[PDB]
Amino acid sequence: SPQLEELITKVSKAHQETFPSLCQLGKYTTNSSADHRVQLDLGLWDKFSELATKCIIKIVEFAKRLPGFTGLSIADQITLLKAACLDILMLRICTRYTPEQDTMTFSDGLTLNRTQMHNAGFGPLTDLVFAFAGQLLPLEMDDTETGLLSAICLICGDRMDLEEPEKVDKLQEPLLEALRLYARRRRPSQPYMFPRMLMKITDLRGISTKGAERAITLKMEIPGPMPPLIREMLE
C-alpha cells in the first residue's frame, strides 16, 4: 500500500511532465485550410508531423520513468513502444478536445478545428477520432488516470515478439491495481469507471489500427517520406 501510493504518483508526474494539460497551454490558431475539407494541406501535415515526432520522444521519456520499464530488455522496450505509441498519441490528442469549439490542442498550443485535423492528415479517419474523443468526455478522467491508462496500454505482455512477456505482465499488474484504487477513491459513487477506462483501451486499439491504415494511404499523398520516428512507430 505505501509502494502502490508511490507508483500512482510516479506515473502521474511522469505523464504530466511529458504531456501538458489543456489548462496549462497558451492556445493559438492557424487560418490554413480552415473551412473546407481537402485531401491534404501540406503545411498542416508538416506541422502536425513535426508535433507528432516531438510527442513520440515525450512518450519514450514517459515510458522510461515507469517503474521497471528500463529493467526490460532494450529489445522489449522497443517492441512495447512500437506497439503502443500510436495508441498513446491518439489518446493524448483526444484528451485535448474542446467540445464547445470542436477543436484539438497540441503540446505547443496549436489548436486545430475538425476540418484542419482532417486536412493535416486524419482524412477519412477524422470523425471517428473525434467520436472517440467525444465518448471519453463522460469519463471525466484526470491526469493521473490518463497517465495510468497510458502506462497500462504500453506495458502489455501480449505484444508480438516480446522476449519476456511474463516479466511485462508482472510490471502491468501494479498499474492495474493502482488505477482501480485511484479511480474508486476519487469517485466512489461511480464504480463502473475503472472497467469503462479499461474498455477504452480496446476502442483505442481499434482506432490505432485504422490510423496505421490511414498512414499507408497518406504516404501516397505527401511528397516525401514520413519523419523517421513516425516510420519506426509504424513498422
Ligand SMILES: CCCCCCCCCCCCO[C@H]1O[C@H](CO)[C@@H](O[C@H]2O[C@H](CO)[C@@H](O)[C@H](O)[C@H]2O)[C@H](O)[C@H]1O
Ligand atoms: C515506437 C516509436 C519509437 C521507438 C523507439 C525510438 C526511440 C527514440 C527516442 C530516443 C530519443 C533520443 O533522446 C535524445 O535525443 C532527443 C532528441 O534530440 C532528446 O530530446 C530532448 O529534446 C526534445 C526536443 O525535441 C524534448 O522534447 C525532450 O523532452 C528532450 O529530452 C533527449 O533528451 C536525448 O536523450
Ligand SMILES: CC1(C)CCC(C)(C)c2cc(C(=O)/C=C/c3ccc(C(=O)O)cc3)ccc21
Ligand atoms: C501515423 C500518423 C503520422 C499518420 C496517420 C494519422 C493522421 C492517423 C496519425 C495520427 C496521430 C494521432 O492521432 C496523434 C497525434 C499527436 C501529435 C501530437 C501531439 C501533441 O502535440 O501532444 C499529440 C498527438 C499520430 C500519427 C499519425
